[PDB]
Each structure stands twice: as structure tokens, then as C-alpha cells.
């Protein structure tokens, strides 16, 4: 599963069964036809790849009952090594389109100690190397697609193999329609009641207009606590500022009519 996605943290939490598969000629055995499966504690007695996640912020291997690892040997010496991992990975987000946005979050897999001269990475089965994408149930997002990549990345200490797993997440707008946009529209409509009240009931006209402006300001300020204080205008910010302009001019209008009526 992908457990949660956070704009305020610019990260997401991913739980996965992660597996690796390589030959070790030293572990080849003969006279036994079975694929030997051993207690996971053998993992501390064997060489295993230095695979790590570059954009991981915080992760752990599950440990209830006994640490969630598997090793399965085969006669030719190929080792199948598997882990269950939960990782919170960084995903910087472009919120200029928010909440009508879609985001490309990725997991960067790399070998830390060994360069391309010592380790090579590849997806087993190519595009079918990643499964379980069908069982992600994020409320806010629906996964449009996922993509698998392979590359070499160059540092001052050498060239290293990289594998990348990517998701295209597109947000569900229904929540914001029910919670934010519709109330803004309704408060904007509430402003237009002003023009039906007789023009000499100044107290009512003013009370309704100023109430609308105040409520719109509160709607503006409440939302930005739920998401990062990023220094640009988002889609919803433009919408709410336009609605503010409308409800503000819907009170400058009363000022105009009152001045024309009582003074000029």
C-alpha cells in the first residue's frame, strides 16, 4: 500500500515487499534437488547487496514476531532475498495547480557502496517487475499510471546503478467541491441578497455585506494552515481572491448607492 501522502511534509509513505535475486557461486550445492529455504537469521551470515533508497526520509524493516526477511537458496547458487519495508519518501510537489493537480512521486533505488563496475541492477520481468499497484486505495489520489526506469548516476566517487519507480497521482476534486468551493459560492450568493433589501435599511445592508466579507476572509485564512506555506498563489487562492473581489465590490456598491442617495 501507499499509506498517506502529505503536502505539508512533501512526502509519502510506502509499504512494500522488496526482493532481490543474484548468483553466489560459493553457495552452489549438489546432491539435494530441493530449493532450500532457511530461517531468516541466515541473512546476517551471507553477503547481500548494499541497496538503498536515495529519497527515503525514514524507513524500517518490519519486526513483529521475527524480522520480516526471507532467503531461499537453489542448487545453482542463486539467492532470493526478500524484505517487507515501510518507507517515508520525499516527493516535492508543484501545488500551483492545487487542488486540481497531479503529482509524480518516485522511489529511487540505488547501490550505495558498489559502483557499476561491481553491481548491476535490472527489473526482473521488465514492466511486470512491480505488482500490487492495483491495491492502492488513497482517498485523495487515483494512480493514473506507474513507470519503471533504469539508469546510471555519476558522482565524484564513481558511477552507480539506479532503478526508479514512479507514480502519476491525480487528485480527487469531489472533497474540495463539497468542503471549500461550494461554501465559497454560497457565501458569494449570500452577498447578492443585499441588493433586494431596501436601500434605506442601512444597518441590514451593511451587516450582511460585512459579514460576507469577514466570512470570506476567514475561509481564505483557514485553508492555508492545512498545507505548506509555499510562496505563490495556488488555483484555489486565485478562486478565493476573485470571490473576495466580488463580495468586496458588493459592499463598495452599497457605499456608492448610499452616498448617491443621502448626499449626492
Amino acid at each position, epitope marked *: 500500500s501507499i499509506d498517506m501522502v502529505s503536502e505539508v511534509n512533501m512526502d509519502y509513505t510506502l509499504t512494500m515487499y522488496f526482493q532481490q535475486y543474484w548468483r553466489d557461486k560459493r553457495l552452489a550445492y549438489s546432491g539435494i534437488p530441493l530449493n532450500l529455504t532457511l530461517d531468516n537469521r541466515v541473512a546476517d551470515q551471507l553477503w547481500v547487496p548494499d541497496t538503498y533508497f536515495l529519497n527515503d526520509k525514514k524507513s524500517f524493516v518490519h519486526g513483529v514476531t521475527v524480522k520480516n526477511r526471507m532467503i531461499r537458496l537453489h542448487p545453482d547458487g542463486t539467492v532470493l532475498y526478500g524484505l517487507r519495508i515501510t518507507t517515508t519518501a520525499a516527493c516535492m510537489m508543484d501545488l500551483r495547480r492545487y487542488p486540481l493537480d497531479e503529482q509524480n512521486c518516485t522511489l529511487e533505488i540505488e547501490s550505495y557502496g558498489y559502483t557499476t563496475d561491481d553491481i548491476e541492477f535490472y527489473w526482473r520481468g521488465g514492466d511486470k517487475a512491480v505488482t500490487g499497484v492495483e491495491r492502492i486505495e488513497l482517498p485523495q489520489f*487515483s494512480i493514473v499510471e506507474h513507470r519503471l526506469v533504469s539508469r546510471n548516476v555519476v558522482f565524484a566517487t564513481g558511477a552507480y546503478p539506479r532503478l526508479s519507480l514512479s507514480f502519476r497521482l491525480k487528485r480527487n476534486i469531489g472533497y474540495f467541491i463539497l468542503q471549500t468551493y461550494m461554501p465559497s459560492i454560497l457565501i458569494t450568493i449570500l452577498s447578492w441578497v443585499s441588493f433586494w433589501i431596501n436601500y434605506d435599511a442601512s444597518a441590514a445592508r451593511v451587516a450582511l455585506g460585512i459579514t460576507t466579507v469577514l466570512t470570506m476572509t476567514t475561509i481564505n485564512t483557514h485553508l492555508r494552515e492545512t498545507l505548506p506555506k509555499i510562496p505563490y498563489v495556488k488555483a484555489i487562492d486565485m478562486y478565493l481572491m476573485g470571490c473576495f473581489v466580488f463580495v468586496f465590490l458588493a459592499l463598495l456598491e452599497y457605499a456608492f448607492v448610499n452616498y448617491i442617495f443621502f448626499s449626492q
Partner: nanobody
Amino acid sequence: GSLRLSCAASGHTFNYPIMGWFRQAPGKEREFVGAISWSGGSTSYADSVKDRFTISRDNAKNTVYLEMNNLKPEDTAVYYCAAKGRYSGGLYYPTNYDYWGQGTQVTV
């Protein structure tokens, strides 16, 4: 030729987020065809029907559809609609599916 199969589900489908299509004929094991997820829309197809068939859904009607575009003679089989629990195993294995439809024979 071209054809569409349909599957209507009722009951506690929330416990069974994924619907899968399977097919079988005499002298052969049951085959995985494709799958759909309620409320997610994601699909995956067996390579034998990839780019030929497509599966879709109507969440309000609680119906699942499989578009049998560009049929071929080898497609002759009884096609079964089935439901998969949320924490069952892989898609491709019929043993992971609990509730099974009556199945429709097709001839080509």
C-alpha cells in the same frame, strides 16, 4: 468479431475491491484474463488479450464489463466473473477469488 461480456455484483462489494475475469474450456486449466478495481479504475491484462480486450466498470450500477474486441478462434471458453478479497494474494491465481459467477460460454 467483437463482443462485450458483463458482470453484475450485489452485496458487500466493499470487502471485495477487485473484480477479475477468468476463462476455461475442456482439457485446460482456468486462465486469468484481466481485472478491475472498484473506485480505483486500474486494470491489468493477460498478455494473451493485452491490447485486444479491455475491462471497465459502472460503480453506480455495480456492473463490470469486458470488451471482447477482435476475438480469435482460440478464445472459445466459459468466462467466469469472480471477486477478490482485499488482502488475498496475487491477481493471476483463481484460488485467491472467493465468490464466482455462473459463467458464460462463448463459441468462435
